[PDB]
Amino acid sequence: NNAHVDNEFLILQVNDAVFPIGSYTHSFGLETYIQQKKVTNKESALEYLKANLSSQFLYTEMLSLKLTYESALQQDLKKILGVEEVIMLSTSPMELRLANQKLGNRFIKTLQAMNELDMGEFFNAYAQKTKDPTHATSYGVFAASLGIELKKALRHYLYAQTSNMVINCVKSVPLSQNDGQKILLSLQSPFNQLIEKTLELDESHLCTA
Amino acid sequence: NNAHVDNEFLILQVNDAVFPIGSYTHSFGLETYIQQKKVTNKESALEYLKANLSSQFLYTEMLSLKLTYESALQQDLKKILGVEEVIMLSTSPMELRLANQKLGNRFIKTLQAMNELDMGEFFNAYAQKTKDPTHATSYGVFAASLGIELKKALRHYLYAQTSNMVINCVKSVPLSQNDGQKILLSLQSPFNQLIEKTLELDESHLCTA
To answer: Mind listing the GO molecular function terms for this protein (chains A, B)?
Structure first.
């Protein structure tokens, strides 16, 4: 039914910076740290990025991606909605809440506008009931529905979000293009640690960072 | 070694639109079709892309990537420079042959800037001796040098270039973002046919389109 669809390309397409889901929300803490003169060069940007990756980005976004992926495999919509409720309640202020929700809704809507892509009955049920979808959670359900391997879905999502964070630093600090590339390289070892950790964590760790 | 380096992440990084090598040059052969009202919608854009992908892009760019990858595994530098000579000599107009060179030169330099990345003896020797590098040929040597699988290298390069082409159509026709996503989805089957075809071609087909 998705005979004409190739997951190897589809994972690249939905993680492409150009995938049309409205405006982005990672540049949030950054602009504050720039005004505070806490992030003003390559070295300080890197430490900022590592700190962020291993706090809220791991314990909220990455972990939630995994939780909704695993629950989707068990057709457990209830747990998915519960994860989304926990995240919504731990998110402030209302502007970030609103934006994250917009991003979530846009991700789902963009998939759905591709009429020739069949997401399956479970995904479409999720799409109809979700109140506070996020990019990471709806992605988790997306990957589970199409049978994309978890470690691969994570790796691709992790790289894409981080790339967005770094290009944010390059523009806002600013940094040099090569500085951004050096940063992305040095983050590869943290990336795999992050992925390892994500697999060890369970729902009790959700939003604790 | 490259102990801290993960090819899984590096392949995403070098194919990111953010990789600072400058703008791709597929945009050159589309402006006329638009002006002349030949590419006007999603449908005619798809056809133009399919035609483009399976002509000059296949017989020059994708094939050249494959040929320098293969020669790199044999550590046959003479054959690599031979491929680049053929492309340089077959490329007009002058302006496009200069743009392509820059793009190729920028790819190599960007890699070299990342000092914590060890490209290895052969790639360094290629870097010292190349005269008319291109993005595709330099990328081929890069992929083989790091032990990245050929089909995977092709898939990532192909998707990235095609995303760029589609974005050009979206911006130029212009088209809606949704239409661009439908186009990329529709091209997944063609992508696989393009890759299997690439593996069947050899030097005797180089630049014959």
So the answer is: nickel cation binding
